[PDB]
Amino acid sequence: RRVDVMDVMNRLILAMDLMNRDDALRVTGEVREYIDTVKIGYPLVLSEGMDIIAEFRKRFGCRIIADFKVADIPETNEKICRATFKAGADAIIVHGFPGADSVRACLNVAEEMGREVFLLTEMSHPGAEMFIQGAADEIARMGVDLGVKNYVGPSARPERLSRLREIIGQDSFLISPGVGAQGGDPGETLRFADAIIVGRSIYLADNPAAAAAGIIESI
Amino acid sequence: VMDVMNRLILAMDLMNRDDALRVTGEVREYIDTVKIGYPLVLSEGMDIIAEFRKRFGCRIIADFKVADIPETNEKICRATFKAGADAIIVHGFPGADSVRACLNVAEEMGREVFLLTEMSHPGAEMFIQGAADEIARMGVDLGVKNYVGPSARPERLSRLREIIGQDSFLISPGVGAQGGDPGETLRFADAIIVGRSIYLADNPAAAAAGIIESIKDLL
Numbered sequence: 347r348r349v350d351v352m353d354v355m356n357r358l359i360l361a362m363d364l365m366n367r368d369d370a371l372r373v374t375g376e377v378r379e380y381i382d383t384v385k386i387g388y389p390l391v392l393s394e395g396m397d398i399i400a401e402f403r404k405r406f407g408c409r410i411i412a413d414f415k416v417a418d419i420p421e422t423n424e425k426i427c428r429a430t431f432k433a434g435a436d437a438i439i440v441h442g443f444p445g446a447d448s449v450r451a452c453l454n455v456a457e458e459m460g461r462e463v464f465l466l467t468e469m470s471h472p473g474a475e476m477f478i479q480g481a482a483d484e485i486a487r488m489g490v491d492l493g494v495k496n497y498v499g500p501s502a503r504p505e506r507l508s509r510l511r512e513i514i515g516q517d518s519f520l521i522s523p524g525v526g527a528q529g530g531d532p533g534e535t536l537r538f539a540d541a542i543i544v545g546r547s548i549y550l551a552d553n554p555a556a557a558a559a560g561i562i563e564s565i
Numbered sequence: 566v567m568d569v570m571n572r573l574i575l576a577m578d579l580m581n582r583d584d585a586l587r588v589t590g591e592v593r594e595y596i597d598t599v600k601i602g603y604p605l606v607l608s609e610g611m612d613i614i615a616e617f618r619k620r621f622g623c624r625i626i627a628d629f630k631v632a633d634i635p636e637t638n639e640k641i642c643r644a645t646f647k648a649g650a651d652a653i654i655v656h657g658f659p660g661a662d663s664v665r666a667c668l669n670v671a672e673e674m675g676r677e678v679f680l681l682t683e684m685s686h687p688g689a690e691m692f693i694q695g696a697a698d699e700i701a702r703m704g705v706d707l708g709v710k711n712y713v714g715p716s717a718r719p720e721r722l723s724r725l726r727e728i729i730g731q732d733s734f735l736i737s738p739g740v741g742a743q744g745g746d747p748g749e750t751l752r753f754a755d756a757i758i759v760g761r762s763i764y765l766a767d768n769p770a771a772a773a774a775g776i777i778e779s780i781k782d783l784l
């Protein structure tokens with residue numbers, strides 16, 4: 347679809363937020379036919395340890411995005427990124443709201459370890475309207491100023507998601523949560539995002555495989 | 566409320582278990598409250614929290630800067646309280662629903678939430694500073710009683726204290742390595758948080774002793 351970057355399989359990323367290793371491995375195995383890129387966050391890591399990342403990579407041969415919403419001072423951010431890449435994460439998700447130096451600290455580690463940073467510029471939940479939404483454009487422009495090429499932005503009104511894409515450019519890579527459980531539509535979101543992120547609609551389904559196939563079908 | 570011992574909280578951001586245990590053991594005489602963050606937890610595991618509580622009989626504040634959607638926030642809080650943390654630090658920038666999610670888990674498990682309203686690093690001026698007063702007011706609206714604000718100009722910390730009232734509990738990082746003065750900060754904060762000035766000291770006990778000496782009249 348793009349010649350400059352390869353799409354994740356089916357342009358669909360699994361948000362694996364189950365907090366039990368057995369369950370997380372089973373459900374992931376059940377949709378691996380459909381998905382080759384898994385987002386692992388604190389719910390799973392704080393429950394089962396950082397070793398889970400390497401276990402996923404070995405068992406499933408998938409890409410791993412560590413969704414750690416990094417949001418500390420530069421010095422602490424560097425330590426978090428280092429531990430995370432040491433654990434085998436292909437990329438880490440970093441909040442933009444704490445400012446440019448905090449983001450730069452993560453970018454520096456990513457450069458040293460040959461990994462990637464995704465910048466979170468805007469969020470999907472209702473609370474996001476209070477403070478994040480007002481800063482979102484400026485956070486995205488900050489990302490561009492810093493040379494960030496990978497972004498996280500939410501499924502939203504076309505006029506909104508289009509604005510993000512306008513800022514970051516067509517050459518940037520954009521992944522988008524808020525699809526399914528939170529009300530976002532997979533197809534509409536993929537008009538602007540390179541990939542959609544889906545958690546509960548898949549991992550809480552009676553039949554995870556059917557949910558995944560069903561989503562892919564709807565597009 | 567009872568003061569934290571000597572109004573001094575150790576930021577234990579070493580990433581080796583024996584070094585972390587050693588330094589903490591060396592200053593335990595002076596400090597009975599320890600802030601444990603992702604640098605330590607992501608390197609040594611969540612079990613380090615219960616180990617500290619057992620070995621040192623200290624209260625543990627989990628500095629996880631929780632900054633996700635409500636549903637993910639709830640999972641992170643649950644895992645953290647299950648690991649034995651007495652309190653968790655939550656970002657206010659993501660809005661009221663994300664904070665309420667943490668408050669709800671804290672209520673269910675008999676633990677506490679600290680709201681992070683403003684930060685100490687230069688990047689904090691970009692987006693956080695402009696929202697800090699309103700994040701603090703949101704905290705008041707939600708019934709938050711515990712806050713984190715940075716060691717800074719009396720004006721800044723005074724304004725935060727004004728908003729949260731005299732009854733609220735306020736702790737403040739940015740003391741020592743980042744240039745903050747222990748005595749001036751304790752003018753408004755109930756306790757100061759100190760990391761590198763202690764844990765990177767040739768003599769941590771001596772470093773801790775010196776800080777306390779310098780604030781003798783305020784204890």
Ligand SMILES: O=c1cc(O)n([C@@H]2O[C@H](COP(=O)(O)O)[C@@H](O)[C@H]2O)c(=O)[nH]1
Binds near residue numbers: 468471498524526544
């Ligand atoms: O703005 C955002 C940013 C996120 O990372 N997320 C994350 O994306 C995932 C959404 O999962 P779900 O499809 O179950 O709503 C969760 O892991 C959540 O933490 C989000 O929902 N909204």
Ligand SMILES: O=c1cc(O)n([C@@H]2O[C@H](COP(=O)(O)O)[C@@H](O)[C@H]2O)c(=O)[nH]1
Binds near residue numbers: 685
């Ligand atoms: O505004 C803030 C909020 C923090 O939690 N922190 C945290 O407080 C500690 C400061 O440690 P130090 O005294 O070495 O600067 C670190 O754990 C950092 O992540 C901070 O420095 N500034």
